[PDB]
A paper describes a structure:
[name] is an archetypal scavenger receptor and mediates detoxification of free haemoglobin. Detoxification involves haemoglobin binding to the abundant serum protein haptoglobin, followed by [name]-mediated uptake of stoichiometrically diverse haptoglobin-haemoglobin complexes into macrophages for degradation. [name] contains an ectodomain consisting of nine scavenger receptor cysteine-rich (SRCR) domains linked to a C-terminal transmembrane helix13. The [name] ectodomain adopts an architecture consisting of a ‘base’, formed from SRCR domains 5–9, linked to a four-domain ‘arm’ (SRCR1-4), of which two or three domains were ordered.
In both cases, we observed a single SP domain of Hp bound to an Hb αβ-dimer, and this was coordinated by either two or three [name] ectodomains. In both the dimer and trimer, multimer formation is mediated by the base, predominantly due to interactions between SRCR7 of one subunit and SRCR9 of its neighbour. The [name] trimer has a flat triangular base, with the C-termini, which link to transmembrane helices, emerging from the flat surface. Protruding in the opposite direction are the arms, which extend away from the membrane. These three arms collectively form a binding site for one head of HpHb, with each arm interacting with a different surface of the head. Analysis of the HpHb-bound trimer showed that each arm of [name] interacts differently with HpHb. CD163A interacts with the Hb α-subunit through SRCR3 and SRCR4, and with Hp through SRCR2. CD163B recognises the β-subunit of Hb through SRCR3 and SRCR4, and CD163C binds to the α-subunit of Hb through SRCR3 and SRCR4 and to Hp through SRCR3. The structure of the [name] trimer bound to HpHb revealed spheres of density, which we attribute to be calcium ions, present both at the interfaces between the protomers, and at the interface between the arm of CD163A and HpHb. The structure also showed that ~68% of the [name] interaction surface on the HpHb complex is mediated by Hb subunits, with ~32% due to Hp, suggesting that [name] might mediate Hb uptake more efficiently than that of Hp.
Numbering used by the authors:
A (entry chain D): 2 to 142
B (entry chain A): 152 to 463
C (entry chain E): 3 to 144
D (entry chain F): 90 to 97, 107 to 347
E (entry chain C): 266 to 347
């Protein structure tokens, strides 16, 4: 569970990330695609070339979703209701991908903000991303 | 029973005049549910303990879950009454509540409330500090806006003409974060008469301390420095006698029109300037939030912050 | 498999790493983020708080050893399967570390490599690094 | 009864025989417990997979593949749900042929006395998801302490009195909580069940009789360490229907 | 089952009835076997079966089914997994 100190760490880290969140999300999407090709099956109608604006916008959307989740860390299931229903029944995204994406997102932060990515902040971000993934994948059926 | 044998106590609080409400009946300690609990109940309670002027009332898990039976629920009380057990109620020991609905109260007698500013340019500019139960703390900036700054400036008694948010030139505080999510409407006599999140569970950190800058309006100046003319360059702000720059978190031509209009230099064209001269370095900055574009001055722009963040 | 460009990139980048710090940091990150892995390292004493594991010399020594194994694997990219066979038997027989924990080590190791390299960790070389960590994880599995 | 070969996240190496693995026709893994030579226990939610709940159990039975021991296949003959499945997710499954009890296939027999006392330490093993949300290749087993019922009700529903309940499950989905359930907290190292371990027995080791007793069947595995409590159905509250169903078949 | 807003009586948007009202079907998971069983059920030739609504308009009201899988053996649509 997210302990109150854990919440403070997550809040501070996502405040420090700043407006670069959209770029980081796009980079995370591209990195997940490149590392594990199998995750591209869920984007058949997507221009996945280098510098594509489509994946840029998708990463911006994911980053905005995560920022909204952080703002509502105490009531996360309600914040991600629509996205949970979209990823659970409509798209039927497998749970594994989520963890993959999380790791990718994490590494992106480590690549751009080494100073603030202390081990405690690492634990906090991992717990928060695990909670988000579990909420989005909960109703998988 | 006429109520003489009954006794009441506040437990698990900062001191005797604050905490969870408990009462003794039939030799058993118990709590009171927060159903239909308001400031009238709080005054009734801080009329009987000799602690006066009930500051705040709570509910649920503010002070921790209690133990024992529950005596009262769904009470209706007036603002002036001798004791809590004289109010109209369904019956002793009759309730639909559980210990996740216990009630707590904070009175003024233990709460020696006071407000101050520290570590700023002028007597009434800088970081806000609130005294609670003998300990000084700060206020989280989340939800801190111009109306709250107006209330604070009026509370301390210095000009209310221009009241901005932001801890100018002030460093991060140490200690407690007593207040958060203050929601003053702009006319309350003190910052703690407004609605605000509980005093316990805050996730802010000390990089987020709140502050205010109050001024008559005769000490704020705005200039363009660096360039061949008064109408082009980097925008610099001299507030009180402190010099600083503006951060471009959301800088666009929309706010450049307001700034150019203020200086009387026409309309904004480009967000850059030929490097004619050199400008000195400064550490305090000003941050803006989405000016509409038709404002007659940059000071009228909604919720502008004077320091307290970084432009990394 | 690794294409010649990926091989060149991965070898060149690994040539810039330091043995004595990055492996220990990766191990400490695994201990702090996934608590159930402390059971195996109980021998190293106090692992209760992050600063303790970061400040433990034994953690740094074991990080050095695992990084040496990783460098050996890099030197035997073609024959990873036989390179780590002894270690596979060791972890399968005496310790009962599940195959997933190896991949956990690989991900934290990649994280700290990103931490150290900064901008230099371009996604194309990260793909190769993911492939090599996957290879070593599979080789150690059973 | 109750003699495993070896009493003892950590990879099992000869300790949990009663466990059984199930996969639906659309490749989702779930767990089950051996109760006797020919009968099993499982959660009802593991039976309404990839089809509407209006279907009959006869339609469910042939669409589920079942493994026991070391990847030993078995065939399902019948599936019978509890008449009040909407509030208790017990579901029993009958094997095509009675299994030959051996070290790798051996049941877990049921409590004669309740063991869901706060602080009691029990064992839970399952084929569910892991830290990377991939189904575990090797059987996993964890140790959990029983947790207070009132705290669990507060965690998932807020208040104990029915009129004042409102949903507050941290993982979105809400479990079935009533007098037929009990909850368990995380382990010492913050280990908790996740997707796919439903149906796994909450085993308690009684030293006086040196016997393992199945104390509950996990009915909420969506906690995945995000929620603080996992939810189980009490076997003692289900003993009678189990006995009646076994006798009737 | 009915076909509406199509070129002939044998092609168009597919509708299903329940509780006394008609409703539409989602195309996701709708494969050639589903169209084959839909054609077979109705009194229409079944030599060639294709997916898609031809020059038809958008739907109205509720969507009363999604992600079906008939496999081609079930005589009628509602006998399939849904
Ligand atoms: C932290 C985890 C994730 C978050 C916060 C997230 C968030 C979002 C958001 C905000 C949208 C846009 C919805 C809309 O515009 O209506 C979306 C759509 C989508 N997501 Fe995710 N997502 C996550 C994980 C994943 C993963 C792991 C995958 C696949 C491997 C995935 C695949 C998709 C797809 C295919 C769409 C539809 C895009 C489209 O139709 O244009 N998502 N997600
Ligand atoms: C995935 C890549 C891994 C590599 C390359 C690796 C390599 C090694 C090597 C070379 C040793 C020998 C140390 C010695 O002889 O003193 C060792 C020992 C050991 N490893 Fe691993 N290992 C890996 C994964 C893991 C994981 C994931 C864990 C636990 C989570 C683990 C736990 C241990 C333990 C407990 C020892 C013995 C330490 C002691 O008792 O002194 N290993 N490993
Ligand atoms: C998409 O395509 C179909 C196939 O053409 C359209 O159906 C046709 O719609 C036209 C209107 O443009 C109908 O024409 C009318 O026919 C009657 C025949 O008695 C006549 O009285 C009218 O003067 C007019 O010509 C036509 O009957 C109808 N069907 C056929 C077989 O051609 C359909 O409207 C299109 N749109 C949708 C939403 O489906
Ligand atoms: C930041 O704050 C310090 C606080 O000390 C400012 O110095 C104060 O200036 C006012 C106005 O003249 C005086 O009343 C105080 O006595 C001063 N304090 C001193 C001199 O210790 C200072 O000007 C500010 N510094 C910067 C760099 O912004
Ligand atoms: C400035 O523009 C806004 C947006 O239309 C408008 O509401 C406001 O009244 C304007 N202010 C003045 C002083 O005209
Ligand atoms: C199901 O619940 C009903 C509620 O009235 C009860 O009468 C019945 O005995 C229950 N059945 C079982 C098998 O517990
Ligand atoms: Ca209430
Ligand atoms: Ca009440
Ligand atoms: Ca803030
Ligand atoms: Ca406010």
């Amino acid at each position: 569970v997210l302990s109150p100190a854990d919440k403070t760490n997550v809040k501070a880290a996502w405040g420090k990330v700043g407006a670069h969140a959209g770029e980081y999300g796009a980079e995370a999407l591209e990195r997940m695609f490149l590392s594990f090709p199998t995750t591209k099956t869920y984007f058949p109608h997507f221009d996945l070339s280098h510098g594509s604006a489509q994946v840029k916008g998708h990463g911006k959307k994911v980053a905005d979703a995560l920022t909204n989740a952080v703002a509502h860390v105490d009531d996360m299931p309600n914040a991600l209701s629509a996205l949970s229903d979209l990823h659970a029944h409509k798209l039927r995204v497998d749970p594994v991908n989520f963890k993959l994406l999380s790791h990718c997102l994490l590494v992106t932060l480590a690549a751009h903000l080494p100073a603030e990515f202390t081990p405690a902040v690492h634990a906090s971000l991992d717990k928060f991303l695990a909670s988000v993934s579990t909420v989005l994948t909960s109703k998988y059926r | 029973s006429d109520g003489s044998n009954l006794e009441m106590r506040l437990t698990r609080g900062g001191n005797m005049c604050s905490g969870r409400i408990e009462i003794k009946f039939q030799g058993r300690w118990g709590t009171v549910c927060d159903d239909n609990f308001n400031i009238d109940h709080a005054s009734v309670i801080c009329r009987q303990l000799e602690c006066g002027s009930a500051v705040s009332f709570s509910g649920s898990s503010n002070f921790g879950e209690g133990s024992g039976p529950i005596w009262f629920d769904d009470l209706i009380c007036n603002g002036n009454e001798s004791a809590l057990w004289n109010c109209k109620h369904q019956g002793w020991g009759k309730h639909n509540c559980d210990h996740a609905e216990d009630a707590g109260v904070i009175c003024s007698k233990g709460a020696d409330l006071s407000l101050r500013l520290v570590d700023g340019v002028t007597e009434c500019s800088g970081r806000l500090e609130v005294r609670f139960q003998g300990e000084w703390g700060t206020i989280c900036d989340d939800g801190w806006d111009s109306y709250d700054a107006a209330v604070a400036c009026k509370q301390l008694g210095c000009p209310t003409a221009v009241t901005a948010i932001g801890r100018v030139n002030a460093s991060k505080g140490f200690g407690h974060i007593w207040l958060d999510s203050v929601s003053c409407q702009g006319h309350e006599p003190a910052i703690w008469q407004c609605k605000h999140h509980e005093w316990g569970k805050h996730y802010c950190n000390h990089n987020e301390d709140a502050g205010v800058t109050c001024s008559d309006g005769s000490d704020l100046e705005l200039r363009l420095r660096g360039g061949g003319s008064r109408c082009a360059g980097t925008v610099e702000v001299e507030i009180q006698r402190l010099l600083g720059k503006v951060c471009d978190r959301g800088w666009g031509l929309k706010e450049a029109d307001v700034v150019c209009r203020q200086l009387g230099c026409g309309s904004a064209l480009k967000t850059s300037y030929q490097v004619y001269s050199k400008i000195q370095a400064t550490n305090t900055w000003l941050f803006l939030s989405s000016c509409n574009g038709n404002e007659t001055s940059l000071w009228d722009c909604k919720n502008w912050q004077w320091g307290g963040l970084t432009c990394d | 498999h690794l294409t010649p460009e990926e091989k060149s990139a991965v070898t060149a980048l690994w040539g810039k790493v330091n043995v004595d710090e990055v492996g220990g940091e990766a191990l400490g990150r695994l201990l702090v983020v996934y608590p159930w892995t402390q059971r195996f390292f109980e021998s190293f004493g106090d692992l209760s708080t992050p600063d303790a594991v970061m400040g433990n010399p034994k953690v740094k020594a074991h990080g050095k050893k695992v990084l040496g194994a990783f460098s050996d694997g890099l030197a035997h990219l073609d024959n990873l399967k036989g390179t780590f066979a002894t270690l596979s038997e060791l972890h399968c027989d005496k310790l009962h570390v599940d195959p997933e924990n190896f991949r956990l080590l690989g991900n934290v190791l990649v994280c700290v490599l990103a931490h150290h390299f900064g901008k230099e960790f371009t996604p194309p070389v990260q793909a190769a690094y993911q492939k090599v960590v996957a290879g070593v994880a599979n080789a150690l599995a059973h | 009864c109750g003699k495993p070969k070896n009493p003892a996240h950590l990879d099992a190496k000869g300790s949990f025989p009663w466990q059984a693995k199930m996969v639906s026709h659309h490749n989702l893994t779930t767990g089950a417990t051996l109760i006797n030579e020919q009968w099993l226990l499982t959660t009802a939610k593991n039976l309404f997979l990839n089809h509407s709940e209006n279907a009959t159990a006869k339609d469910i039975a042939p669409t589920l593949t079942l493994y026991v021991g070391k990847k030993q296949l078995v065939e399902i003959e019948k599936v019978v749900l509890h008449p009040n499945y909407s509030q208790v997710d017990i579901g029993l499954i009958k094997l095509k042929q009675k299994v030959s009890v051996n070290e790798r296939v051996m049941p877990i027999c049921l409590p004669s006395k309740d063991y869901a006392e706060v602080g009691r330490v029990g064992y839970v093993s399952g084929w569910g998801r892991n830290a990377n949300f991939k189904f575990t290749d090797h059987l996993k087993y964890v140790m959990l302490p029983v947790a207070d019922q009132d705290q669990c009700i507060r965690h998932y529903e807020g208040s104990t009195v029915p009129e004042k309940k409102t949903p507050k499950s941290p993982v979105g989905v809400q479990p079935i909580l009533n007098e037929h359930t009990f909850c368990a907290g995380m382990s010492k190292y913050q280990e908790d069940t996740c997707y796919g371990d439903a149906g796994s027995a909450f085993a308690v080791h009684d030293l006086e009789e040196d016997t393992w007793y199945a104390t509950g069947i996990l009915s909420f595995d969506k906690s995945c360490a995000v929620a603080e409590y996992g939810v189980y159905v009490k076997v003692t509250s289900i003993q009678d229907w189990v006995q009646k169903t076994i006798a009737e078949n």
